Amino acid sequence: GKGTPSFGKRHNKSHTLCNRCGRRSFHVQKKTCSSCGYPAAKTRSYNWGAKAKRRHTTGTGRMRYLKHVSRRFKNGFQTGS
Amino acid sequence: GRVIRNQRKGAGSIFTSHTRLRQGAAKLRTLDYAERHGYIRGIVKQIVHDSGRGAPLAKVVFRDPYKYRLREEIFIANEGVHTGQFIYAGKKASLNVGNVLPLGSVPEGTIVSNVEEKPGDRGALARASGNYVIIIGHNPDENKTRVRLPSGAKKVISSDARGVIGVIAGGGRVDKPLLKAGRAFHKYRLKRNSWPKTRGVAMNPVDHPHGGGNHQHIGKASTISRGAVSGQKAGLIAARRTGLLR
Amino acid sequence: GKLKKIQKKYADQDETERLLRLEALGTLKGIEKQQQRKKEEIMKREVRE
RNA sequence: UUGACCUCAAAUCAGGUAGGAGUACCCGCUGAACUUAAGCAUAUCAAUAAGCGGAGGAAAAGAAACCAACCGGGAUUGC
RNA sequence: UGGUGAACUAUGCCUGAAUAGGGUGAAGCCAGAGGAAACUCUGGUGGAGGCUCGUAGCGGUUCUGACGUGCAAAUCGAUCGUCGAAUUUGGGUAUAGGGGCGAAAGACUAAUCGAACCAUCUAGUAGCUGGUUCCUGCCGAAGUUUCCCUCAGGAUAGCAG
RNA sequence: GAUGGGGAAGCUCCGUUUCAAAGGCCUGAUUUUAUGCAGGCCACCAUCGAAAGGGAAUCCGGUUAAGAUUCCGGAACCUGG
RNA sequence: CUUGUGACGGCCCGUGAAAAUCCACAGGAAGGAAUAGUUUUCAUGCCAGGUCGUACUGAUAACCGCAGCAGGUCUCCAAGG
RNA sequence: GUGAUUUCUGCCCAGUGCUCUGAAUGUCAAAGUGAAGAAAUUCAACCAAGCGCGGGUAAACGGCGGGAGUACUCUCUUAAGGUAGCCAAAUGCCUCGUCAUCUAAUUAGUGACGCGCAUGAAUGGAUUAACGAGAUUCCCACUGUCCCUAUCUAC
RNA sequence: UUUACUUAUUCAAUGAAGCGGAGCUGGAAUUCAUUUUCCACGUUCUAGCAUUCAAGGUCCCAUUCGGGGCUGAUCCGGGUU
RNA sequence: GUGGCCUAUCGAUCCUUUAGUCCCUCGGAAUUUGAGGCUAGAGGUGCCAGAAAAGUUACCACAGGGAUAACUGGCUUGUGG
Ligand SMILES: [Mg+2]
């Protein structure tokens, strides 16, 4: 009974939500996220996972400060009014 | 081939010793000043059972000579020690059972136990139940003592090493048959995960050197060289002789 | 090379202990046999004479 | 006793700086096998892919412990 | 090559929990009797055992029953093994892929195991199988020679344009 | 599972009291006063880990379409000050 | 009958957690009364008790098995013959 | 490794392993030493462990023969020749072995026999109470398994 | 090949507490002139107790509430053993 | 008369080595060792136009094959009847 009766015993999560990415990939016993690598300082990325890099790279979010850097450069980082 | 069972034992994943119900390391009192210039008197408060150990332990209380407090040491109980007995530890201690005299100050034929190898490691030799060390001879110049060990070997150790006079309590245990796989289960359940033992000749050849074949047989000789490597040392390692002698 | 070994592990052996070990190993029997063979060689020459 | 020197510390001491992201191109380390040899082990793939460390608008290299053998040339880079 | 899994399951640890009613009647003890003494006998008491019949529970022997495009990628029915322990089990925790764990079947490691899964190298290689897209006109074969780890393949000569 | 350390080219690995100068505790004293200087005491030595282990203290009656040992009425208890 | 508990008895080469936390004792540091104090482990009296969860199912239809699947999934209460 | 108890575990160290505190130039690396050379280099001596020589070890892996004569004995051969036990056994080709028993009839069962293709002693041998969803044979009871089929209910 | 030496290196313990040398004070000791040495150098019927820079002695201070130094508890070398 | 009366009686590249020329080269210039070349032999591939090479799989896998076995059918009928 490795199929249907064994699927009834599944009610204990191995992963919960992660703090940096909100992914539900944070392993409870390992205390590590399997997608972004929290709590390591570097973010988990691999050159074989180029599509995953495309999924989580810069520009897939809000860019709350980086949207204005090109415009401030074009104006020359001016000050005043 | 796979990694065999005795090869897997050294990682210590499930092969660590079960130490939940143990009462502390049974060591001798440290050799500070009193034990090497005079003696010191302590008291046996209680004799208790140690989990996974065949011998009982003794809880001996001394006074700290430098601070107002009490020290509690765990000795291995000698056969004949009772609760409320005064235990004397030191160079000038009188020769009675339970006392912790150094080996330079006991005569020929003395039976001691919990013997230090070097002066100060707080007990190494003859600690299992019913075992003892006999003093075979002295050597004052180049101050050493010869001792007979429980294995029958004769060691030559320092005369400043200490030992508890008498034999370890709880002797004669292995004379009783266990009679039951349940009894062996409860015996090893508090020691470590090394039981039950599957024979390697009953395995598959991926799992052991002895495994495989259309009959259960070893194949080559079971005596293994000392220069063999891990994964090969399964059998009788470096056997000088085999068989039942008559 | 042999001397190094004897010093390393067999230094603390009383002669009585050593003799027992040698008998168990079977080294003693070999020494005796070698000597016996030497005696045999001399005996053969005498027989020819 | 007092005052130096040397060395080593402590401060939510005064002021600073490093980490992470990106990584097409750049500077290094580490490092395969599929494949080809009509098999295969040196070889090849390849001083490559994957992995790790570190920069900039370029980086690196760069003003000879050079090339030459000629009636000698003259930093580096690229075609 | 680099990562992800012990939510199933294997094993150890830590902390909890669960297990009707019967049968047999072990030590210890009490009374009576006998004996010269050792000690024996009889009647009770007591309630031992990896004992036994048998529920809940755990498992899965047979019908090679049902079903077999099923209720179900392993179930249903009857018959069964076991049922106070080497028992069953929750949660926490540890062991990760030539590695783990195994009362040992090459078993189990998320329906995947005589080496898991994911992505990349990778459009891996194939003397082997299958396919290969409009018309008309003209010419029109070979299965033979020699060499090859050659015998389902090539080179070379021949035949053809 | 950090730190002190020690490996590792490195991502990181070991170790958890270790070859560390590892800290805070009460009385106060002073009443330019702030909290130093009077003192004296103590050496564990991060932290995480149980909604079934340990653990301060609440019960009854009534009430809603849907909440209650939590609201209402009454009657208690514990902790800190 | 279910359950709680007490005093016992049997078993073991099995003798069947730890820490936070609270109390007591030994000790005698120090502070202390006579026109006055010393005591808040006695009684009464005063103030405050933050944050998050709290509905419902828990299974032949609320979970997992592609589903409103005869499967699987821990536990408490338990009337009469 | 073997697998409760009882009773035993015979012979063989030649081979393959394992192991010696033996004896010591046979094999004999790098470094080092010596000679020749102008030097690169060449040639020798010396030379650690391990091999090689000498022992031990079978509850280590394993092994346990022939030909004659009259159970016995002789001869050859080997490391030593199967001991105690057991058997057409789950191990026997021939084989449906031979004898007895069980039946009307038995390639099945059981008890014996043993030149046993190719049984055999911790590769464990023989025996064995109790136990077994283990394999096999016979007997009593019992029955639609069958002679030989018929009928009824629910879906 | 044997054999010193310790500071490199290595192992172990401790909250780095009693190391080494010399000296007292006793005992043995035979001294052949005066001491050569060697052992000691506060604890053993009893499941109590042992802590407040220590009492005492002594010397200062400015007496008072007390405070400090030496000794009690032998010197010397800072090599934790 | 350019081996055996005739028809069989044998071997590439790379590497090593020998003989000859004592000839050519070691590329800044020479001498001498050393090395590399040219011409002709030898060391050998017997699977003989010339890979350096043990098994097992009843746990097995892939690409194919009726070019190829284990059934029936078909031809034949030795053998059988
Ligand atoms: Mg186990």
Ligand SMILES: [Mg+2]
């Ligand atoms: Mg085998």
Ligand SMILES: [Zn+2]
């Ligand atoms: Zn994350």
